[PDB]
């Protein structure tokens, strides 16, 4: 047979500051020159955050797409594909961050009288990076619900970016579903004192979510159940808490119920927003995608505390990522993950980290459910070893010289475009990496054509999503090293 299906697309994330904090595009010459280097390297496309805080920052439904239209023109001009992130979250916000784009001010002004629009921890601190899913359907924003704001925003995107959708330049719409665009709770915020590898905190104490839990608990026959109060704080370790210790509460009926409620609220948050995104982009030659955070710390202990507080109900015998993958199937949505470049030996022992096992579990879960799985690197790397790790995860069993690979990533996106990537040995090493991802076949402008987006299949009962959690299956086999390594 033939081995064309070993080809893995490579995308490059554009710089964080590509559009200025005042929603102006001022880097036309630089970007054009940078994209020229990417085409010379055989890159398939680029990816960009489309910041809600810029486009709708001046007022409700006051959409200004003018800066992004200019960037998209340069990408189209370059013959590159484009993945657009609907970025409903804050950019920056930490002391020292250069690019700071909070969510629109008129949205946050509602918090002056209703601070419960923000994800809230047990101590009462409000996180302003992203609106709590508890107000998904609360009409608090000049009459609109949060989901309405997101759907209207994506609708205006489709109408205004018609030229690039019709031409096929845009191939993916990534729907931001939480902090950093990731479908998770803000369980480890730097802005509130979290330091790696703290277990994080459950962030479900805003009045809307607490009322939701109260109702669910009452209906379950346990009105005495309250939200956890024994889980510790951001920087604790699992054994210093009653919730996560051995024979802790997370193993009790009470704990199991809360964790199920917590993680299920997140899954249905994505399910409903993907449903509305599917209707907005119906007929467009795009695939919808979500982004899953790579919470690799405390993976090597039974409590998986850091994953649990982020909203991923993942245990040694419970696959908290295949449930998410099962939810995505009806939307034909792709699952975008991270940590593609990480090796277990690169992490510290005290963090109980296992990024390789995490990546293998997530990829395997997506592949078991027939999804397109794509990945990013979590940290900026320019060394051959990082690329060889990505190559391993891109084709776990290497090249199939007489057919399609057993499994493969649908794509990889490199974080992140910069001048240091495009100079000297960094650029030469990157170009070799693209060649190996393409299986030495060369850049293919027409690979993986995107079919017109079809309507989501019928919504599943939560039982069908939860069925995927157990029995937890072993991951598909991954080779230790790629068969197509890059020379240092």
Numbering used by the authors: 3 to 490
From the paper:
A refolding attempt yielded soluble, yet misfolded and aggregated protein. However, we were able to optimize the expression conditions to obtain natively folded amylase (named Tri a 17_active). The far‐UV CD spectra of the inactive proteins indicate the presence of β‐sheets and random coil signal, while Tri a 17_active exhibits the high α‐helical content of a TIM‐barrel. The crystal structure of Tri a 17_active shows the same (β/α)8‐barrel architecture found for other plant and bacterial β‐amylases. The structure superimposes well with the previously published structure of barley β‐amylase (rmsd = 0.62 Å when 442 of 486 Cα atoms are aligned with the PDB structure 2XFF5), which was used as the template for molecular replacement. The enzyme shows a tolerance for low pH, showing maximum activity at pH 5 and retaining over 80% of its maximum activity even at pH 4. In general, Tri a 17 is highly active in a wide range of acidic pH conditions (4.0‐7.0), similar to other β‐amylases, such as the major β‐amylases of barley. The protein is most stable in slightly acidic conditions. A maximum in melting temperature is seen at pH 5.5 with 59°C, with a tail off to lower values as pH increases and a sharp drop in stability at pH 4. Tri a 17_clone and Tri a 17_inactive were recognized by 24% (4 of 17) of wheat food allergic patients with varying intensities, whereas the folded enzyme (Tri a 17_active) was recognized by 41% (7 of 17) of wheat food allergic patients, indicating the presence of conformational IgE epitopes as well as linear epitopes. Since the enzymatic activity depends on the correct fold, there is an apparent correlation between enzymatic and allergenic activity of the β‐amylase.
The wheat β‐amylase (Tri a 17) has been found to bind IgE of wheat allergic patients, but its structure and allergenic activity have not been studied. To evaluate its possible clinical relevance and to shed some light on its biochemical properties, we elucidated the three‐dimensional structure, measured the enzymatic activity, IgE‐binding capacity, and allergenic activity of the recombinant enzyme. The β‐amylases of crop plants like wheat, soy, or barley have been under investigation for decades and the presence of two general forms has been described. One protein isoform found in all parts of the plant, termed ubiquitous β‐amylase, and one variant specific to the endosperm, featuring an elongated C‐terminal tail region are known.
